[model samples]
Target: ARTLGVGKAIAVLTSGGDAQGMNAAVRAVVRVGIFTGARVFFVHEGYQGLVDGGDHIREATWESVSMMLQLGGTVIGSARCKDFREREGRLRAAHNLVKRGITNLCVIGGDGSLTGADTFRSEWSDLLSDLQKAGKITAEEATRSSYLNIVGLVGSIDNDFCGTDMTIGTDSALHRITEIVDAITTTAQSHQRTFVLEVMGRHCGYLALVTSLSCGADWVFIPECPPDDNWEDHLCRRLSETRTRGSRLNIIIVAEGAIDRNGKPITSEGVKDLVVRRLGYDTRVTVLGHVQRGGTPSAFDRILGSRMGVEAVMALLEGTPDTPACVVSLSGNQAVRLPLMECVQVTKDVTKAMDEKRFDEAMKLRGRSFMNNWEVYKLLAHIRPPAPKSGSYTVAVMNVGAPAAGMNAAVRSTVRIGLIQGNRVLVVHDGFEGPAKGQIEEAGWSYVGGWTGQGGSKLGSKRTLPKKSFEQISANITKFNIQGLVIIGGFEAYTGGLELMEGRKQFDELCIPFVVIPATVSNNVPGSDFSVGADTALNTICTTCDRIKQSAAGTKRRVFIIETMGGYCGYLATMAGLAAGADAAYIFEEPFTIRDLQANVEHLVQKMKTTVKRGLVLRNEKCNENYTTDFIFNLYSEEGKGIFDSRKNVLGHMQQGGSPTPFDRNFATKMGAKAMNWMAGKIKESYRNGRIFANTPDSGCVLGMRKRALVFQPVTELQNQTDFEHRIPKEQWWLKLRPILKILAKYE
Candidate 1:
């Protein structure tokens, strides 16, 4: 290992309000700092500890960060630290850092905290010189540690910061909101009532907007986009219409900072009263306050925090005197650095825009993703009457392969978008068998009203491909007058799309435009960086691992071998291992022999002698045909008969059976809309003199998200990229992330 940080001393602290995954970030910073041959220190109580540095600044060991990744809040602590706002306090902090030769600092917090850090960095030289003059530090110490290196990791739940796609705690906060909303829906429906739920995000509406989208709320009031003067009448009328249409309950989401067109604050109680007064419905108000800030961070947050922490450390190490103060931000799937002060200024500008009543400008300042979500929500929240079947074409949607979360959401989006675009949308039941057996029906706006939060396939799904039923499928397609198709599922969906594309040679009806939307927990779909249901599955595994690890910790000298489902892909196993801090992950992508198993066993045996006695190993369900989960468990139990014991847990379909996470719901919604849009374009292209016919390879394509951009790659083009034998993509982007898991687990 090259010593990139040999002469460096790094200190980390979490400032302002606490957020989930802060501990994971701190753990990564400490471990990566030590791995690069640098001394690491923890500043407890945030900037207060930095200013008053008696016992708050302490050296950190590798094991100190062990088991901290799964915990919530900041273990190093965060505080208001009013003293750090002044020059005299920063002088004491400078003296404290110089005495310990800690020139590098990693700050994790909101924009205000990050801005304070940049201010401290800018005045570091003056502070050090002042401290020397005041005799707080010797001249030699001041001269040695002159310049301060700073890097920031945003840890806000609001996701209000600019330049970054998501702050550390935003996903976890969304999880909390969606979970509560999902639970509330059942009770509201039981009484046929209305509920007004308010979520956090004082200046930003990310949480409220996403919760509404995920849970199918009837209406939403976000801070960026307020309602007009006639909003009250419109809201009541919409709820009235939904009730008349057989909807049992009405749900409304409001951001804490939501305001009306007149700039008056919108309260949940106010909305509830209006609904009750105007519509005379039983309405309730629930304000989710600090509850959203507490939780075990989701898999996305854990991985995101870990990746950002590593990047922050690297940014500090790679930084030169000329390098500006930077913050690590997520751009698409990659982490990039931006000037810290510049990001802070942009974040402040959003608030400025809001204060100035430039609401649209504020929404634009939030980022493109936020603006897109707002647009999508506007289209999805309303229920339109069945469109007049004026168009000559009809589109069909179906599900294939194993059931995964977000299937219903994708179906909902496709049906609604297709219908809204002047085409009749047909829902196919039970995969390819649906079309073959003629189980297809036209879907209306209200048909998919509350399907976003649902798990599994509402239209049913099976692993049946199109090869065996091509004739009947074509017959049903022609019988129903279906001109476009959208298939949503796992590998079976991809294969079925290919079959239909190739079957066009024989069947003329199959020539109509069709698209495949990848929806699988395996995340093995070709041409996409991530599949729809993978995030939900990964979160399920991570949370289960948390509980299993807690159980293992209750007993001494215990190691658990967990089997995760991802077919032969290993994505679930590998990502879960990283999120849960497992010692090893067995995946088919990286083969392991019996000797490798022995090495892992020996490593665990050695690990038992350390302070952290419990160990966890994750294996993909089909990682290997020989080294089965039971085999590894029995081997570990027998080999460590006198030293340790082993437990085996095969997390079966539970990984596939949860209310889809916010990520899945949102991702599926976007992919579904994009799929339908692509289908519409192809449908238009196929229509020649009133007869729909599509013959080109590009007509039947798969709409996948490649590198964060949704692309329509022809099914024939993706054939060479897919490995049909193993049912996975030939090139997996997540495989490259495996080494980071090993390094974090101390295997490297």
Candidate 2:
């Protein structure tokens, strides 16, 4: 097949369970489908409505999904369609599509939903022929609906999808868990009690596992690792030990399907009762039912959902309508199409036989679509290798450049984990300027206790580079006896990274370990696809755009030219535009010429002059100093002869502030904990054979998540890479997204 020409059409539906970002996906499908010059229809009430066959199918417009990016449930609705399984039921649904002249399909839901989609596409040609024979649809209509192009977007909250690193609502659910547990922890600590909280994971441990790692839960129970016969005894001992260590509150997180060795079920109430009865501790039980599935979608989920939706639309237009339908999935930093049938059957499944030596089975099964969070769980579980020689070392932690949402979470996790490893932890206040100008303090457990949910760095951060001479920084290192340094920030931190690597040569005795955790909302860093604060900032961007859009839709029908922060990079602008359903966007990487800008403005004006009325354009604040938000607004309104009444709004620093989103908190916590362990392991290795791995490029490396796994990249290499301005380490993922925005912004 060449490509879907101008006359094709697509219909979308939300099937099975509702996820947080479903509406966003629907919005993208409708807008992008129309942008592709394809007629777009929506199947209401899921497959049940498709079979209901009256007032169920309707045309979808851009405004149908406006202001729905943050909503919890599906605007199109979702249901368990038993009717969709039968041949006759499916036949009716297929006939309905042909009747509406819909030629292609987009399904957003779990494995079952996609399976139904694949089956329907396989029978599309038959349904068209049958409909024509029955005199239901005209021969022209039947001929136009000759073929079907189907694509699936994984929308499960359990993160159970096998072909994407994350499903649409997983981050939203995790946010709910962390938010509830965070509040519960305060009361539990005040009352000196232990809380046993249960969360739903649909028999998958991804949710429970990540929650435990993030919330610092003392123990976690998941279906993947069934409890032994003496599980109660083990729990009692662990609680006793935690209490003995003067830990005020103990949290035990359990997945809904957590089971015993015999596959017997374990409930939250059961665990609470056992804790009170056997160990004689004050305990509280809480089951976070559908509440986990409730909430405005997190920034990560909204962006993922929107991006996945656009990609699915592309798959329908550009891909082959073969036996195995395509599913748009997150592969590394880019959205790619994978075979729906193959991906549906493959997942990180646990072995029924509880062979203790087979721990690697779960850890090894993680990738772009499965659970690599096991690695974080193992680190949280205190799975450490024995050390032949042990020694305590001083570790300095600092945050460089502007503040980001997850700085505190990462800082807290690092301090706690470092303390657990018997290393002295000091907070370098005000970034590198702290040591350079001297404003440092030791951060204890009490200092980080309430900092996990807080935004910005607890120690405060500034745009401070290391000393140019390197003598003062080395002096501070020697003065503090700091053998390890953890630098958290964006591009500036990487710049300081190079200086630190060179500083090792100046002070021969100070072979300091250094690591940089990517933390900017810009997400413009070279080595990592994800930065600590980008998701939270992304949410703020969408929320701001939604507000601006609401006002734009109300009054004179103006084009709201909004500016977003991401200096020299367009990650934030491009994603926010996609999530917010903006008319168009101006990013830094793919610069628009004067003619391109005029044409884009003309398109927006013409589109708004008709049906849409309201429009939004996301412009990267640093795209070009000459082409500011004001400049863009003038070009749309004044330069275009008042065809578009335009207004300008700068999201400003508000994007950088807010409580960290669930995804960011989890990511920061993981990065913090894992970085500490990586350092500790290196220390153990050095002591094992007295072989020094210091003063090398790979020493103390920069930690980042790549291909859905925690990877340590050589700071020297990452710093030395060309095209750092475009974040090429991600393989130009934004390049693909940038063009799609153009398609979505197409004028009729």
Candidate 3:
């Protein structure tokens, strides 16, 4: 268990604005620091504590961070310190750190906070010399802690930092925004009202843009890309057109920093007034000021914070005196370290670009993903259906496998994008059974209105594929002239796609281009790093675990064995375990024996002896056929005669029910659009003159994220990679993260 951090002393602090996942990041740093055999200290009230060191800096232990993963905000506290900007203040901070033998520091905050940290690191030597001259410390003590190591984790809701793809708190912020928007949709629709909602993000437009895309807003005003001078009239006309198309509700999301082409701020109240005057509709303005910043961090945020914290600790431990001050940034699924000042400078450059009216350059600096999302939102929000012409292709959209959240969002994206591209979009009800029974209907633009916030499958879904109904399915495909097909669901969708790819030999209708967009909670699709609904399911499980843990803590000396649904796969169980801070997670991919169960019981027995006497263990529904949830519950209950009590909770279909998370909605939206685009390309490539035919195996493919990139892998090509019996991919990526769960749980 020897590591580079063994002899090092590390101090951690959170500065700037409070974020939802700050607690999770703090917990990871404390636990992982202690786990790696390093003494960890927490600086309360941010840099103010560093300068005015007394009881503000305190030693952290494993037990101190227990039960904090599910909490929101920084428990150690954050404050505005005007003193930290001065050299004397930094000198005082250096004396405190040198006296305590703390040389390494981990900071979690926004760009400004990180910039301060880098400045402190750069002045470490001079500050140490000044401390010695001031008689604050001995020369030997100053020499021992001469080089200060620093690592930063961006914790902004704005996601404005240039280095990382996402900041720690952005996803949770989106969750809050989407939840509020979804709630407002019902009342707005009922009363036929137009609502103007303003979200946070003073400099960045990410929150507003993503919220609009996720909730299917009519219009969005962001700082990065302002509307033309005639935007007011255009906005009024758009709302009027939406109402004329039989829509009862109109939602407009505006970033707090939204401005017009003339650089005038666009207030929500002003927009509401224009809507009420020009469109003559019942208009309301809701400004969500600080509410978006509060809430329990979502699963994505918790995991991202945890991973970034771990990387930050590692970077500090692995650094030398010459190593540049680093900031831990998330590049796709991986955590990378970039020079702190470099990232800070680039982040400030974005503001410079915006201030100078370099709007296009600002958009580019926001990154390619942001630009793509803006484009997609514009296309979907103000869709102008082209005039019907000859040789118009027909695309069929259906849901397969069990119901999962975000199915409707995927369907909405598919239909709208298909229609926008001059294709006749057909909606099939009840999955494959719909085609067999001829339950296919054409969907217009307004048909999918308000569907982005829906849960489960609005079109109905089934587990059975087109096995015996191949003839009927083919008949209906030809009957409706379906030239392209989209299957959105779980592993069943993958299998069903393979079935259709194989059936193309017997039925000519099945030969057309088809794409499978994975939308299952299990996240077991062969080719995807993430399925659409997995994030929502993980959040549901984590929230439930939080409540259960609270109950266990109140009772004392109780261990809860919870079961999660993932069919034969363990993606839900494993990920929920990581996010929820479970002591152990039992999954099908990693088999356990009776001895392992006995050791886990012993571990819990020792845990009950500690001050934190509550434990949580998550098991997949079918982790092992012989050792079921009841079996493990009874074993734990029997093993603990007097030390502790055991409770078993089998989380049922509730995991599959609930409004889709912001991640699910956004991910599903992107996947659906990409799937349709892929289908269109394949259709154009396969179609010749009038007849549509495809002999290549690449015609039927699954569009999924492979690691960091969205890849289209042919259905037949992925057959060897899939474990059909267990119905999961053979090489699961999340399994590599299992050690992290155990390490943080103190199992190692």
| Sequence-dependent TM-score of model 3 | 0.97
Over 4 Å off in model 3, which ranges?
552-554, 655-657
Error of 3 at 337 (Å): 1.9
lDDT by residue (1-748, candidate 2, tens digit) is 2135367888888997888999888888887877777878888988888888758888877656666776788989998889889877877887777667777888998877877886777766766666666647476563665467789998988887676778888888898898898788756646458888888865577888888866767788876666767868788887876566567788889898787766677888899889889887779888898888887887777778878888888887875544458889987767888987777655524332223334335434443222445545544444222332255766788899879988998898788778777777889988888887767788765567646668877788887677474677667766776667788887778767776777677665346567889899888776777888888888788877877877636566677889998876788888888777687778777777888787777677676667666778889987777887778887777854555567787887674348887778778887887787787766555443343336666665778777556788887777566365454344545667666666555543
Candidate 1 clashes between residue pairs 3 or more apart in a chain or in different chains = none
Candidate 1 residue-wise lDDT, 1-748, digit = tens: 6389998879999997878889999999998888888889999999999999869998999999988887888899999999989998888787788888888999998888999998888877767667766646465573555457899999999888888888998899898888788888756546668888989968889888988889888899888888857878888888887777787788898899889886889888999889988888788888989989988888988998898888999998897777789899888787899999899888899988888878888887886878888888878886574546676468999999888889999999988877777788899999999999999998977778789888878899998888788889889898998888999998888888888877889888888988889999889888788888899999989988989887846677788899998888999999999999998999999999898889888777777766667888898888889888888889877887777767888888675457788889999998788888888888998888778889998888888877656789998999999999998999887787887788788775
Cα RMSDs, all models: 1.7, 4.2, 1.7
Report the lDDT tens digits of candidate 3 across residue range 1-748: 5376787889999998888888889888887888778889998998889988878998997889876777788899999788989898888887788878888999998888988998888877767667766546475573566468899999989888889989988899998888788788766546568888999978889999999998888999999888956878788778876666777788899899989876778888888888878777778888887778888899888998888888888887888888999999888677789999889888899888888788998897886689888988898886468885577888999999888889999999999998888888999998898899999999988778778888888999988889688899888888898888899988988999888877888888888988899988889999888888888888889888888877746667888999998888899999999999888899999999999998887887788877658878899999999998999888888878688877888887675458888878888888889888888888899988688997698888899887678989998999999999889998888898888888888885
- Model 2 scores a TM of 0.87
Weakest ten-residue segment in model 2 by summed lDDT: 348-357
By descending lDDT, how would the candidates be arranged? Answer: 1, 3, 2
Model 1 accuracy (lDDT, Cα)? 0.86
